[PDB]
Amino acid sequence: GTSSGSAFSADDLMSIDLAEQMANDSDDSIS
Amino acid sequence: SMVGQLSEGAIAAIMQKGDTNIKPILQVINIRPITTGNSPPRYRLLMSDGLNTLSSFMLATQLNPLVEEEQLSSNCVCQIHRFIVNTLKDGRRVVILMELEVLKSAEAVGVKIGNPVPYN
């Protein structure tokens, strides 16, 4: 409510990368 | 009402209940890139469900062309078909949009719908 949103550092971005890649890898069990 | 187009309460359902099976219709309010030298950009989105906004939405990298070719842009209305919620080391949670469909272009909507308040 006070700004455009807390920022995401390199470590946070690596975690987001991993989360999306884990979803992609799980898709390989069905496609 | 224009808010009749949006899935009011979907943000609270995602945040409070962790419901990942809904397919809510949301409005993009703003898009901001997050850049790094060797990495593709990561697009962060301020989204609205007509009741709340939330600034911690993140676009899956495979959907970057939608932003780069301007189909996904501020004011457009989209239906989220697949998303996941990820918790960061500091306790913040981000909502990663994996699959979506742009239902109405920014130029066909024209403005922010309603008067949503920030969820956090």
Residue numbers in the entry:
A (entry chain B): 533 to 563
B (entry chain A): 0 to 119
In the authors' words:
The heterotrimeric Replication protein A (RPA) is the ubiquitous eukaryotic single-stranded DNA (ssDNA) binding protein and participates in nearly all aspects of DNA metabolism, especially DNA damage response. The N-terminal OB domain of the RPA70 subunit (RPA70N) is a major protein-protein interaction element for RPA and binds to more than 20 partner proteins. The RPA70N domain adopts an OB fold with a five-stranded anti-parallel beta-barrel but has very weak ssDNA affinity. Its primary role is to mediate protein–protein interaction with its basic and hydrophobic groove and a side pocket, as first shown by a series of studies of RPA70N interacting with p53.
Several studies have demonstrated that MRE11 physically associates with RPA70N through a motif in the C-terminal region, and that this interaction is required for the correct localization of MRN to replication centers and for the S-phase checkpoint. We fused the RPA interacting sequence of MRE11 to RPA70N and crystallized the fusion protein in the P212121 space group with one molecule in the asymmetric unit. MRE11 residues (538–563) form a long helix with a short N-terminal loop situated in the basic groove. Positively charged RPA residues R91, R43, R41, R81 and K88 interact with negatively charged D544, D549, E552, D559 and D543 from MRE11. Among these residues, D543 and D544 were previously shown to be important for RPA association. In addition to these charge–charge interactions, hydrophobic MRE11 F540, L545, I548, A551 and A555 residues pack against the hydrophobic residues at the bottom of the RPA70N basic groove. In addition, MRE11 N556 and S547 form several hydrogen bonds with RPA70N Q61 and N85. ITC titration showed that MRE11 binds to RPA70N with a KD of round 16.3 μM, whereas the triple mutation of the hydrophobic residues F540, L545 and I548 resulted in a KD value that was much higher than 100 μM. Mutation of the conserved arginine residues in RPA70N (R41, R43, R91) significantly reduced the binding of RPA70N to MRE11 peptide. MRE11–FLAG with F540/L545/I548 triple mutation led to slightly worse colocalization, in agreement with its reduced binding to RPA in coimmunoprecipitation experiments.
